[PDB]
Design a protein around this ligand. Structure first.
Ligand SMILES: O=C1N[C@@H]2[C@@H](O)[C@@H](O)[C@H](O)[C@@H](CO)N2C1=O
Ligand SMILES: CC(=O)N[C@@H]1[C@@H](O)[C@H](O)[C@@H](CO)O[C@H]1O
Ligand SMILES: [Zn+2]
Length: 1014
């Protein structure tokens, strides 16, 4: 295993270092506004060294943006694809590339057999080529690597089955910034080449000047280079035709033949395109070839890539003709005029890459190596796209919840082969596809129109229902005596109970377990643990009585804690935000111990009085002029008091101190240790009255944030043996700090209401000597070192916080883990801040046509970990990466993949069993079975189950952490006949594993295996 901590990779271009050196000056470079006047030696080419030009026709189709997926399909895409089939069939030399498989699949299944055969033929002959082959062209900032792989697999699996092809070249022309997580996954999925476009204009200029636009992109910790994937970065401002033929858009626009009038399009540079004729082809070619030759000066080979397309292009038949015939005339002239020394033709992306590498092997070019990412993107001036790291936070949080339900549903149902009548495969396919669709760069990014966001939400809601159905049917089968099991595939044996989504204060949807002497004395509940190691975790349920006790299936009592059900209300009358307690609903909390990738059953029983093993939390409402708070049967009376600082400590864990406004002020790890200053504070950012306005994409603050006026907020303190908390009703936010014995959990019920042109940020102020350094993660896969640059505006220092961020000095580190992707940064030494929500009144001129005024209450969740790290073996100062500690990683897992809770629906569960998976290996803490999915339907003689195994890297800080069993995924199911290592998409076998054993992976490595069973 390569060491991912101690060896600083030696690369030609390291983005953090590059950023440190760059001046980022935004000067007018001429026709190429953000570049310079490119010059080339005409004698560079001759009959012995020609310029090979590949014009690649394409059509960018958004699976939702200003119209819904289905709306675009009916209005544009089905026509584009139908005419593409016709035109490519009739013109053998014409080419076309396609990226979004969600649309292709939607179109394909509506075709007759005659057309399906014609389609298979033009793909087979190379005219129609799929690039990337994912369900969508995913966002690369907010997306979790697990979902990026999910959507890639959904698209490629469909392609292999129906088109018999698997793309090895990726095309990403629209994501707003790019992440190294992509080459990571692609390289492990058979890819050999990739292309990106949206990168900071300053970076494009810098790399173009050194001809480093094509590079071998390796991971920041990879010293050997085995993760390297050849990458091509386009050099200009856009992927449209005016910005892809050469440096001068005024000239290139003349070669977009759809802009002549009848199509309702024109050239903003004022010179229209002109139909090519024998009388002007020489002058036209001279202009075009000159553009090509200038673009060619930016690359290292004599092979040039010229994309030809734009949004939803190549729709009308007349459009196909106008682009094809005119370019055909240019090619004939150019290719026959020796003095040009050019050979131009229509081609595909793979053809371009193949030619480049043939040149490379001929020794005409040596490519540079590069590590780092391409955030935060800016397309012009100070317009940085850091706003979408937070836009529509409700759906960003929903993405993470569905991510987990999909994993749990596929895993729980994978243990058995199911009858088609169970509709398991059906429901799972829908769930995977709806979540996959949302990975689109206008989905999770929060940059779509309001009705399109509603469509995505509806689709995800259906996906959640689908996973619940599969999950509960699975639990019933896994925990019911075989000879008793009698399933009704349409029946709900269990109901999922989720305490954090939509969340308290967002939607009152969780069911209360109703117990009563005259109705039902007890109820069975089941917990599921998707993680490959034993796990204990407090779980809670709503019960109709406070006198409830818990036991496991062996009837052993389990220590429990009952607390009231508190809900906050903005009191329209008194004009205050205060809590109300339930008088008929209570929360029971207890620790559930669940096997690796397994299940554990518990029983809740009612009694007339306080049961021996159940304690009751105390409650303190702090504020002036309080009123009574009755709680029905609740044993203890609520206490009151004037606002005052308070301190709490659950178990033998950390001691937390709070201000009189209910906000964290300090943390004391041990009774010896000092009270470390850790202050939570809420501030607001505004919008400029002059210049450009912030919108769904852009973050253009009107200076540093200003503190939110808190007034005298009401604070509620709940103190219990197992769980305690401090909640405060602040303007726009009900802030809660929960303590269960270890790292505290933070929950924010965010309701920005009608506060227009306001962005709410949560900041942590400490004394940590972090300087200008901080760390943020990329797609929940790796942590990259960031350096605050004062030479760049505030918004440029904001980065995606998909799962976590941290700051540290020689001895102390503060890590904030998130349960949803949001934007954040460290604007000053010792600080950390993350945006909660943003309501913007205007459009930010990027095509959306609206501001963001559809905010809705959302429950954001986090874990705050303060740790001493002076004893940890950390990377040297020059290393571009950072790594979490064991505690921080486990805290992240508690947020992203919590235990699942099921409540038995009926009154009696006959044949109920107490546990499943007790014999499953409890793997090392840094190892995870990211995906478990049965790949075969019941009718297959040889059953196949695929597994994706990921091992992160945790810092060694002096903790013995030992005794754990080896996990061999290939033996998790009986009767294994063979074990093979496959690409991450399970589509290609790479190794036949001897002994049928799947070996564990190295730190930061990800592997996929498929076990076959007879
Ligand atoms: O013409 C445009 N093309 C891209 C779209 O494809 C869309 O997904 C982007 O959000 C949006 C970002 O500006 N886009 C445009 O305005
Ligand atoms: C779809 C089909 O049956 N056609 C075959 C395919 O099975 C085979 O894998 C491929 C090799 O690339 O050659 C095609 O002609
Ligand atoms: Zn797009």
């Amino acid at each position: 295993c390569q060491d991912v901590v101690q060896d600083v990779p030696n690369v030609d271009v390291q983005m953090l270092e590059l950023y440190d050196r760059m001046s980022f000056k935004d000067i007018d470079g001429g026709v190429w506004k953000q570049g310079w006047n490119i010059k080339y030696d005409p004698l560079k080419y001759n009959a012995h060294h020609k310029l090979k030009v590949f014009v690649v026709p394409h059509s960018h189709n958004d699976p939702g943006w200003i119209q819904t997926f289905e709306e675009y399909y009916q209005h544009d895409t089905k026509h584009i694809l139908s005419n593409a089939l016709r035109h490519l069939h009739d013109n053998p030399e014409m080419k076309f590339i396609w990226a979004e498989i969600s649309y292709f699949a939607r179109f394909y299944h509506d075709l007759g057999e005659n057309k399906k055969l014609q389609m298979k033929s033009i793909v087979k002959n190379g005219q129609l080529e799929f690039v990337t082959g994912g369900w969508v062209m995913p966002d690369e900032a907010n997306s979790h690597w697990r979902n990026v792989l999910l959507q890639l697999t959904e698209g490629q699996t469909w392609l292999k089955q129906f088109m018999n092809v698997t793309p090895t070249a990726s095309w990403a022309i629209d994501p707003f910034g790019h992440s190294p997580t992509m080459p990571y996954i692609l390289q492990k999925s058979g890819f050999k080449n990739m292309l990106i476009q949206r990168t900071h204009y300053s970076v494009k200029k810098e790399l173009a000047q050194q001809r480093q636009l094509e590079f071998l992109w390796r991971q920041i910790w990879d010293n050997k280079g085995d993760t390297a994937l050849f990458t091509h970065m386009m050099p200009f401002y856009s992927y449209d035709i005016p910005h892809t033929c050469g440096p001068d858009p005024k000239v290139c626009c003349q070669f977009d033949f759809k802009r002549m009038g009848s199509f309702g399009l024109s050239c903003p540079w004022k010179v229209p395109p002109r139909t090519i004729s024998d009388q002007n082809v020489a002058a036209r070619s001279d202009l075009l070839v000159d553009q090509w030759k200038k673009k060619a000066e930016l690359y290292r080979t004599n092979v040039l890539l010229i994309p030809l397309g734009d949004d939803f292009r190549f729709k009308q038949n007349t459009e196909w003709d106008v682009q094809r015939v005119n370019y055909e005339r240019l090619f004939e002239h150019i290719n026959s005029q020796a003095h040009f020394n050019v050979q131009a033709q229509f081609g595909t992306l793979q053809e371009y890459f193949d030619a480049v590498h043939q040149a490379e092997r001929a020794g005409q070019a040596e490519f540079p190596t590069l590590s780092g990412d391409f955030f935060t993107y800016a397309d012009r001036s100070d317009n940085y796209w850091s706003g979408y790291y937070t836009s529509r936070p409700y759906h960003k949080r929903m993405d993470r919840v569905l991510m987990h339900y999909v994993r749990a549903a596929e895993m729980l149902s994978a243990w058995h082969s199911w009858d088609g009548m169970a509709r398991i495969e059906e429901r799972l396919e829908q769930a995977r596809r709806e979540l996959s669709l949302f990975q689109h760069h206008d989905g999770i990014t929060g940059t779509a129109k309001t009705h399109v966001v509603v469509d995505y939400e509806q689709r995800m809601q259906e996906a959640l229902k689908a996973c619940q159905m599969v999950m509960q049917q699975s639990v019933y089968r896994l925990l019911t005596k075989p000879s008793i099991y009698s399933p009704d595939f349409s029946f709900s044996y269990f109901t999922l109970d989720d305490s954090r989504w939509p969340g308290s204060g967002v939607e009152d949807s969780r069911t209360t377990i109703i117990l009563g002497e005259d109705i039902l004395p007890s109820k069975h509940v089941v917990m599921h643990n998707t993680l490959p190691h034993w796990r204990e975790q407090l779980v809670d349920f709503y019960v109709s009585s406070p006198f409830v006790s818990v036991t496991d299936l062996a009837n052993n009592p389990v220590e429990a804690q009952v607390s009231p059900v508190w809900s906050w209300h903005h009191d329209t009358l008194t004009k205050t935000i205060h809590p109300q307690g339930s008088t008929t609903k209570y929360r029971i909390i207890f620790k559930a111990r669940v096997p690796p990738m397994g299940l554990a059953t518990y029983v809740l029983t009612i009694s007339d009085s306080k049961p021996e093993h159940t304690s009751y939390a105390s409650n303190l409402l702090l504020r002036k002029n309080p009123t009574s708070l009755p709680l029905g049967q609740y044993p203890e009376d609520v206490k009151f008091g004037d606002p005052r600082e308070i301190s709490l400590r659950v178990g033998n864990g950390p001691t937390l101190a709070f201000s009189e406004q209910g906000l964290l002020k300090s943390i004391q790890l041990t009774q010896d240790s000092p009270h470390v200053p850790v202050h939570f504070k809420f501030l607001k950012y505004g919008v400029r009255s002059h210049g450009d306005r912030s919108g769904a994409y852009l973050f253009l603050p009107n200076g540093p944030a200003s503190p939110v006026e808190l007034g005298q907020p009401v604070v509620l303190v709940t103190k219990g043996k197992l769980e305690s908390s401090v909640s405060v009703g602040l303007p726009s936010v009900v802030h809660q700090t929960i303590m269960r014995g270890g790292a505290p959990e933070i929950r924010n019920l965010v309701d920005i209401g009608s506060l227009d042109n306001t962005e709410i940020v949560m900041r942590l102020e400490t004394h940590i000597d972090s300087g200008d350094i901080f760390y943020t993660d990329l797609n929940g896969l790796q942590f990259i070192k960031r350096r605050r640059l004062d030479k760049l505006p505030l918004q440029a220092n904001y980065y995606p916080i998909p799962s976590g961020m941290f700051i540290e000095d020689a001895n102390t580190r503060l890590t904030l883990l998130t349960g949803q992707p949001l934007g954040g940064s460290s604007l000053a030494s010792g600080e950390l801040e993350i945006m909660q929500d943003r309501r913007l009144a205007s459009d930010d001129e990027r095509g959306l046509g609206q501001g963001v005024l559809d905010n809705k209450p959302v429950l954001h969740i986090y874990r705050l970990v303060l740790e001493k790290v002076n004893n940890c073996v950390r990377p040297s100062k020059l290393h571009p990466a950072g790594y979490l500690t064991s505690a921080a990683h486990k805290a992240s897992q508690s947020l992203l993949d919590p235990l699942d809770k099921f409540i038995f629906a009926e009154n009696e569960w006959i044949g109920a069993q107490g546990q499943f998976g007790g014999d499953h290996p409890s793997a090392r803490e840094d190892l995870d079975v990211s995906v478990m999915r049965r790949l075969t339907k019941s009718s297959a003689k040889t059953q196949r189950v695929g597994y994706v195994l990921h091992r992160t890297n945790l810092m060694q800080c002096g903790t013995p952490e030992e005794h754990t069993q080896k996990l061999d995924v290939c033996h998790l199911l009986p009767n294994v006949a063979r074990c093979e290592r496959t690409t991450l998409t399970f589509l290609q076998n790479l190794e036949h594993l001897d002994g049928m054993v799947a070996p564990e992976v190295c730190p930061m490595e990800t592997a996929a295996y498929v076990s076959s069973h007879s």
